[PDB]
Design a protein around this ligand. Sequence first.
Ligand SMILES: CC(C)(COP(=O)(O)OP(=O)(O)OC[C@H]1O[C@@H](n2cnc3c(N)ncnc32)[C@H](O)[C@@H]1OP(=O)(O)O)[C@@H](O)C(=O)NCCC(=O)NCCS
Length: 151
Amino acid sequence: MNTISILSTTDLPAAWQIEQRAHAFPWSEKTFFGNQGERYLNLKLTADDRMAAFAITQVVLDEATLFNIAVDPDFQRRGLGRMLLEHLIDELETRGVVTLWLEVRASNAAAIALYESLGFNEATIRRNYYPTAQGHEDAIIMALPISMKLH
Ligand SMILES: CC(C)(COP(=O)(O)OP(=O)(O)OC[C@H]1O[C@@H](n2cnc3c(N)ncnc32)[C@H](O)[C@@H]1OP(=O)(O)O)[C@@H](O)C(=O)NCCC(=O)NCCS
C-alpha cells in the first residue's frame, strides 16, 4: 500500500538517506535541514512500510516552489514520483496555490519527463547556471498552472 503523509521531523533521517542515493547532485545537510519548518509543505510517500519518496515545497502567498522531489532508486520507474506530485498538486489547489515553480538541470531527462507529464511548462532557460565538476550546465525553470476547483 502507498500512503502519502506529511514529512515530519522524525521522517528526516530516512529522507536524508534517500537524498544522497537519489540525487546526482545531493543537497548539503544544512540545505536539507533548512528546507523544513514554517511555510514548508513537505511530503513523504510510504510504500508498504518503507519511505519510497519525499517532496520538499515552500508555499508563499498563492504560489509554491518545489525544491526537491526524490524517489529511492529501489522504487523508481514505478509511478510513485508522479503519484506523490499529484497529491502535492491537489493539496496546493486546496490551499489556493495557482502556480507551482521548479528549477531543473537541463540534463535531467527523468525529472524533465515527469514534469512534462504533469503539465509543467518551460518558463525560461538559465544558460550555464549550475557549476559542476565538468563546467556549467543549463537550468530550466518550469511552472505548473494549478486551476482552481470548487470545494
Ligand atoms: C525524477 C524522479 C523523481 C522520477 O520519479 P519516479 O517515481 O521514478 O517516476 P514515475 O515512475 O512516476 O514516472 C514519471 C515519468 O518520468 C519518466 N521517467 C522516469 N524515469 C525515467 C528515466 N530514468 N528516464 C527517462 N524517463 C523517465 C517516466 O516514464 C514517466 O513518464 P511517462 O510514464 O509519461 O513515460 C526520480 O528519477 C528521482 O528520484 N530522481 C533523482 C531525484 C531528482 O533528480 N529529482 C528531480 C530534481 S529535484
